[model samples]
Target: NPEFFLYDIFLKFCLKYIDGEICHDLFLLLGKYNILPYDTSNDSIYACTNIKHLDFINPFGVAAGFDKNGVCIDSILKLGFSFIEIGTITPRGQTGNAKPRIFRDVESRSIINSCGFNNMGCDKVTENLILFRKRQEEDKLLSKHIVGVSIGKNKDTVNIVDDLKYCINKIGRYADYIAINVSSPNTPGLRDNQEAGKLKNIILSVKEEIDNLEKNNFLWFNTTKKKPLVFVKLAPDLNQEQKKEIADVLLETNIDGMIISNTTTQINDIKSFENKKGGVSGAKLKDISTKFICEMYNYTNKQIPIIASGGIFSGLDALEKIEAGASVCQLYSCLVFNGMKSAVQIKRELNHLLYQRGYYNLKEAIGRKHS
Candidate 1:
């Protein structure tokens, strides 16, 4: 706990003196180099479980937008997260939108990003993960954590499915799971890909590709030729009809899970550059993301898993998503508000809260409202 306190001081100083994105990069370097002190892993605060094929040592993970390059997969786990979702990587790699694309609204505990899926491309991200995976095995880190990738197409792509498959082909074997991100607002036509037909097409194609990926020899970890679990990352700004359609598509495809949101384009009460051209995240998005979680969970007959990713700054916030049927929780904006300590603090509180009610793992707490 004292070490957690020290890391907070470091992050606060970095945020105050260093620029936002720059500090993020610096933290990635610190994590990648294993500079952050590695705390001994413990089980008292851990809620180990699984969502379909992927295993989790705890329910908390940093959302995809955080580590775009898979730069610090092991250290992120070292920081107390059970997993880390890396990259909205495109096939060719991209520079994303112009400078000054990230905005912060201190008053409402919110952040906005028109930061299009800026990443180091599929091939480079693949190389990064491959190298880290070897380190993961070498460092004896295979027990406590898993790494997933959020795949997306470039801003100027003609065939979205092609790029999606390209990313899957490159990173699927390395990733414990794959998140199909079709909902980033910064990209011109990305959200439109959420339509049922195109969405189903993408999922169907990848399922086959995943099959092919496993057919030729795979994983050294027992399950010889393993297929990575696939999930769809959706937008919070959806109508009743759109949510219904997406839920149907997911159910039909027997998809692995859904990240309840990316970010909301429906900006409200943001003090800093309220006029910016990006989706809003953090406190303002909590209720909106939860609403979709409830609807999607019910729509899918509680069959698909959901990862809650907006406005989660505490154990109570995470409980809210779980009660609404999310199988796990993820954080991005919460980290900006609470520092990296947010992970351990939240898990500790979550364990304490769940323990009092005789609930040990997240499965027992999920969908409390519906049950």
Candidate 2:
């Protein structure tokens, strides 16, 4: 209980004044006591959905940038997130944007971050994921959920594809899914990668790189898992034509899925930051993210599965995304404003909403609005 006692002291006396990045580094400590066990019953909060190798107990996963380096997998999974997304990791670890890059506003229920993919780089993060899977081989609770790695190029890299390929080649086998993050606003020209031609090239190239890695398996390293599901994470800010182009790319490329958004550069509602330069995520960005999701769902005619994230602080918020056509919803800003119980709270309410609506399963709720 020493960790718990120290963490209690942290939350009580030191957390409010802590920097956002520094606060994230303490997740393992915070998770030491917050294990949400799986329930296998009709009345259970765990819901139903299966895709590729992942059979989710619920549909809530912490989005990218939450556990940037995969350092807190078992810890975070125990906090009731159905899956954990780590990284926004670069090929070579780099100190992203200048200090004071992460800002928090409890009143707004959001976070503004110009982190610029500041992470421990590919090799070190790869080592951590390898260790994580190895532990997942033993810890029962940790084994139930999954991990998705989000890869991004180094801030200064000219040839972005090379950096992306390097990251996928390093950790693809160690993940349940790989998220190609071409959408962080803090990085110069990163969002431009979302364009149709560039987006298609990046998706195909990464998928091909993953195929290349599968040929050289190492049984000694236990890297014999199936190819990870690949999803391209996109930015929330986009024009009408840009959104339709993305939908066309999704239908054409046929990748596993897509994360609806990274973060928004629109700071019209934010009152916490002085310069308003970073990506804004939270309640303010929810509608923008959901609009993109619904548009993609319609443009693709609901052919592509979507994993969405924005300002889902409640089950109703999650339901709104699901109705808009997201297969699963992710949360980050909510965990900051509402606390760890939010995921479990979301699932409980989601289960109740489904039951009240006469839907037997969560799968029945996807894209209901369009119906």
Candidate 3:
């Protein structure tokens, strides 16, 4: 394995001991260890880099709202990440759910957040993206990294479709891909957008914009360049029927992909969280989210890219997601309890699993069940 422990300390102490060019110098010192392991060609982690390159590194990515306004992406990326998604950036800034909106379910190694869409707004997030881009350019180093923008409507954009258009157009250029966030429990009426027709129409509309960009050569690269893909983030609380309906809608709309889950509305599954009024993420939801991914993979027959997120604390936990059909996977609450070290740990163990089982890469285990 790699000296992830030493690297962690190097970064932690460096953040305090260094500043400006010195920081860059320290980062340069650690250049030999390209911490990010997952493939960055697509937002979904399940897809292998070389079609047959199955060493799924069990990506370490932060979910939306982790850095709501995208304030620390460059630093976070520097720390160690395969990919990092930013924002649940709403049309306008709002305070978010309430005072105790974020709770730690320590026993379950989970967290519950009802942080609504409290952010500095789309413009600010895009501004942050611009800065991030500039930093990446200056660094001119390896960025086999994925940067996603999670978009949602403001509390007042009552018209869902119009709201969707506004959000998509505003940040589409800045994001590698956009995660349509319609399933956050903190939003009073947002989940309604997930209902069949409404969801389909919105996805189609966003996709149409992507086509428009490609067809008319809307941006610099013209029609051939792959326009940013669109992904839908869903609530883990959905039932089997809702999940199936969502998968069907994704198939029909030809959406680029799906995040295995957003977070859970039910606190019953988490005996430790104590009925917090928010979406629950972490250990309790791990198995349920994996089952959901497996079911979706089986139902879709690997038709779409699936990025699983929810409860991933160890490499075995991540392997479960990959084998179950997650193209790429993400982590959230576990980061709080286990810290960034979890990212490196998961990848090494995942690789070991592959070698031991003769699976070689992640794809073979994807959607494959035991006898």
Best TM-score among the predictions, by candidate number: 1
Candidate 3 off by > 4 Å: 1-58, 214-225, 269-272
What TM-score would candidate 1 get against the native?
A: 0.94
| Residue range 1-371, candidate 3, lDDT tens digits | 23346646655564445442344334333332444222222223432431122122235567776667777675555444556678888777887765656666466677777677878887877787776766665664324555778888887787766756666666666567778888888888889888878899889887887566545443422111235678888877777777778788888888777888888776676664565677888788888898888878766667877788978877788778877877677777655565446555666677677778787557677656622
Candidates' RMSD to native? 2.1, 3.4, 6.6
Reference-based lDDT, each prediction: 0.82, 0.78, 0.68
**lDDT for each residue of candidate 1 in 126-162, tens digit (9 for 90 to 100):** 9998887767656755555778889989888988889
- The alpha-carbon lDDT assigned to residue 211 of candidate 1 equals 79
Cα displacement (angstroms), candidate 2, residue 61, comes to 0.6
lDDT of 2 by residue, 140-233 (tens): 6665677888998887798789998898778887877889999988889888898999999998998898888867663222222567888989
Give the poorly placed runs of model 1, Cα more than 4 Å off: 1-4, 216-225, 358-360
| Clashing residue pairs for model 3 | 45-327, 45-328, 46-327, 46-328, 54-361, 54-362
Ranking by lDDT: 1, 2, 3
Ranking by TM-score: 1, 2, 3
